[PDB]
Amino acid sequence: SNFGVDFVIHYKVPAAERDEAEAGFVQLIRALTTVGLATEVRHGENESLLVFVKVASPDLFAKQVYRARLGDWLHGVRVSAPAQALQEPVVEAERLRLIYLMITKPHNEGGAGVTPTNAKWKHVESIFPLHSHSFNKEWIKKWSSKYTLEQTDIDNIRDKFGESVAFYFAFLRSYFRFLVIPSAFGFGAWLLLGQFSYLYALLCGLWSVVFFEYWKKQEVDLAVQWGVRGVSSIQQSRPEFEWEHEAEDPITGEPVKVYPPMKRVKTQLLQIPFALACVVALGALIVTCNSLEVFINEVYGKQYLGFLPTIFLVIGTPTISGVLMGAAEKLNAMENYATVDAHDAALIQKQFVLNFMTSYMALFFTAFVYIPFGHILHPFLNFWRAINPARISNQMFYFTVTPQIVNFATEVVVEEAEFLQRVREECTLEEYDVSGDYREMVMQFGYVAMFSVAWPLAACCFLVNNWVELRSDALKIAISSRRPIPWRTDSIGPWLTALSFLSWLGSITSSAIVYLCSNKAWGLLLSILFAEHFYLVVQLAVRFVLSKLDSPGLQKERKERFQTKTPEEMFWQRQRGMQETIEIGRRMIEQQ
């Protein structure tokens, strides 16, 4: 039970530079009082001083809310611009978002910049909302005692934690529900269809298309249901953006904050050497592991040891990749991005490329380098001094079951005093990052899309993992993280593109595997061509079918629209009246 505290600011103050901090402390408090926020300073753990921030008067917040609504209508995410009409009430998500905007936005936008990165607030560590322990307990208990989740649970998640967390949980729920179809015909193929079935690959591609398009429709439906349809158009300035000078684009009077694009491109070009070095190092590691496993297969008991290195490889996956992820972040911090959307998209692209490598390159080597060309691992036995087509199937099994275990291990198993202690322990937790969960789900989807044909049972394992994850991530948000700042998005974002890629490549990969493990380059090229064009045709057909489904968003929009809803002139003086024209026409008929 919180004490009405809306936000908490850390404001670490070390004794080495206390003086510069001390005056800065007052520079904080006044900077809040001018915005109409009541402040509450209290003791902090490890030479810190947490300050609690709440709304001073409800009238100021109502007006702020009204102002926000007006802007949202201006940018087009609202239907009609509405101050005593609150009886659309203010949910906790949007109230917290507006409080964060008041605390964060500069004086130009009616706020007061307390950004903990760019400005003089170098002693402010984190500004975070507090957790509702009763709500978290009820949420966990309700989700852990139900086999399925209706839209009511996702709506509650939206109301409490914002639209980003709600969109992630909706995507996870839809993906888990759609994983039932694939799981069914994967078990069917495993039971009856022998090994490396081509029709299973076709069904997997069809399911990938169907799920991707249906989710693209469902996210639009959800965005319309909430009030966040079109937020992607609203560009948000990044506080960390460093400028060179301020210009004035001759379209508006706004003094834009310019940065030479060529300077940014000169840094973005540093991604190519980084990606090449990462791919070379990981390729060397995977080649070494494959050579060692081939040597341990050739030279002798059980068959579990044959892929023992591969297991270890994935055990090293969350470390190695993690390190790489950090580098990616630094790279994304080196190229300046003036928009939150652009920065997020670039970071997501870099992380997706790195995780794609670290998660799929071993399978790619096993399927398209070792099996077709089984004469390059000669050097393999030569160095280790002291062709099985089921290799890809066993590698897929070990890349399905064991990474699930390692991710579960990483994520799950690893009169005022009580409230103050709770806040103090909350500040040490890490801020929730939904991009990591999105990346994990996208990686699993890619596994299903382009490698489940080797082991069709992978879909069932991923379905069980997704059911467990729908509650594991809820528990992680509830007790293992600070409450995320409630943001607003109309979609899962650039991850959508990733999904499409992982679908398309799947159509080329799966069928190729089917040709390369069931037994001439002509046949392989023909199979790849047929699979890719079948994928494209199915994509067109599914898009056409879903374009004629009459989604609630469209009828809601058209309902709103409906509710809103001399000789040159003597030519006409000859017969000016009414009856004379008819009479003359009748005479003209009689004559001819």
Ligand X SMILES: CCCCCCCC/C=C\CCCCCCCC(=O)O[C@H](COC(=O)CCCCCCCCCCCCCCC)COP(=O)(O)OC[C@@H](O)CO
Sites of contact with a copy of itself (CB under 8 A): 3-4, 13, 18, 21-22, 25-26, 29-30, 33, 38-43, 47, 49, 51, 54, 74-75, 251-252, 254, 415-416, 520-522, 525-526, 528-529, 555, 558-559, 561-562, 564-565, 567-568, 570-572, 574-575, 578, 581-582, 584-586, 588-589, 592
Question: Which residues make beta-bridge pairs with 259?
Answer: none
**How far is Cα 101 from Cα 88, in angstroms, rounded to an integer?**
20
Check binding of 473 to Ca ion (CB under 5 A): yes
Task: Specify which residues 257 forms β-bridges with.
Answer: 246
CA distance 84 to 111: 23
Q: Return the closest-CA partner of residue 6 out of 36, 31, 34.
A: 36
* CA 473 to the chain's CA centroid: 14
Question: Nearest distance from residue 559's CB to a copy of itself, in Å?
Answer: 5
What does 407 interact with, of Ca ion, ligand X, a copy of itself, none (CB < 5 to 8 A by kind)? Ca ion
- What number of chain residues touch ligand X (CB under 6 A)? 16
Q: How far apart are the first and last CA of the chain?
A: 96
Site for Ca ion in 419-438 (CB under 5 A): 437
CA-wise closest residue to 49 among 101, 7, 12: 12
Query: Are the C-beta atoms of 344 and 493 separated by less than 8 Å?
Result: yes
Query: Which of residues 101 and 345 has its CB atom nearest to ligand X in the complex?
Result: 345
Q: Which is nearer to ligand X, 353 or 363 (CB)?
A: 353
| Shortest distance in whole angstroms from residue 32 CB to a copy of itself | 10
**Angle subtended at Cα 102 by Cα 97 and Cα 106, rounded to the nearest 5 degrees:** 125
Q: Which residues does 415 contact at the CB level (< 8 Å), separation at least 6? A: none
**Could you tell which of Ca ion, ligand X, a copy of itself, none binds residue 473, using a CB distance below 5 to 8 A set by kind?**
Ca ion
SS3 51: strand
Tell whether 580 is in a known binding site: no
Residue 245 binding result from Ca ion, a copy of itself, ligand X, none, given CB thresholds of 5 to 8 Å by partner type? none
Q: Among a copy of itself, Ca ion, ligand X, none, what does residue 498 contact (CB within 5–8 Å per kind)? A: ligand X
Concatenated DSSP letters of 336-378? --SBHHHHHHHHHHHHHHHHHHHHHHHHHHIIIIITT-TTS-H
Give the binding range for Ca ion (CB under 5 A) out of 41-49, 304-312, 320-328, 461-469.
461-469
User: Is-contact 163 487, C-beta < 8 A?
Assistant: yes
Separation of alpha carbons 479 and 353, rounded Å: 30
Please tell me whether 150 is known to bind a ligand. Answer: no
Was 411 annotated as part of a binding site? yes
Could you tell me which of 569, 572, 504, 513 has the C-alpha nearest to residue 538?
504
Please state the closest distance from residue 154 (CB atom) to a copy of itself, in A.
24
Closest CB 213 distance from ligand X, rounded Å: 10
Distance (Å, rounded) from C-alpha 520 to C-alpha 518?
12
Write out the binding residues for ligand X, residues 486-515 only, by CB under 6 A. Answer: 494, 497-498, 500-501, 504
Q: Is 431 annotated as a binding residue?
A: no
Cβ pair 199, 193 in contact under 8 A = yes
Q: How many beta carbons lie within 10 A of that of residue 453, not counting itself? A: 33
Structure tokens at 189: 């193929």
Contact pattern for ligand X over residues 336 through 355, marking x by CB under 6 A: ---------x--xx--xx--
Site for Ca ion in 381-410 (CB under 5 A): 407
CB of 39 to a copy of itself, least distance (A): 6
Report, in Å, the least distance between residue 6 CB and ligand X: 33
Residue 416, beta-bridge partner list: none
- Measured from the CB of residue 274, what is the shortest distance to ligand X in angstroms? 12
For the chain, give the longest Cα–Cα distance.
119
530-569 positions binding ligand X, by CB under 6 A: 533, 536-537, 540
Q: How far is the CB of 98 from ligand X (least distance, A)?
A: 27
Query: In the bound complex, what is the minimum distance in angstroms from residue 175's beta carbon to Ca ion?
Result: 12
Residue 437 assigned to a binding site: yes
153 CB neighbour count, 10 Å cutoff: 20
Between 402 and 407, CB nearer to Ca ion: 407
Minimum Å gap between C-beta 506 and ligand X is: 11
Please list the residues that pair with 53 across neighbouring strands: 7, 39
Count CB atoms within 10 A of the CB of residue 374: 12
Q: Name which of 148 and 233 has its Cβ closer to ligand X.
A: 233
Looking at the chain, the number of H-run helices and the number of E-run strands are 23, 6
Contact 130, 1 (CB under 8 A): no
Residue 550 labeled ligand binder: no
In the bound state with ligand X, the residue whose beta carbon lies nearer, of 51 and 282, is: 282
Binds ligand X by CB under 6 A, chosen from 176, 185, 356, 462: 356
Query: Which residues fall in the annotated binding site?
Result: 407, 411, 437, 440, 469, 473
Give me the residues that bind ligand X (CB under 6 A), please. Answer: 345, 348-349, 352-353, 356, 494, 497-498, 500-501, 504, 533, 536-537, 540
Query: Which residues fall in the annotated binding site for Ca(2+)?
Result: 407, 411, 437, 440, 469, 473
Give me the residues that bind Ca ion (CB under 5 A), please. Answer: 407, 411, 437, 440, 469, 473
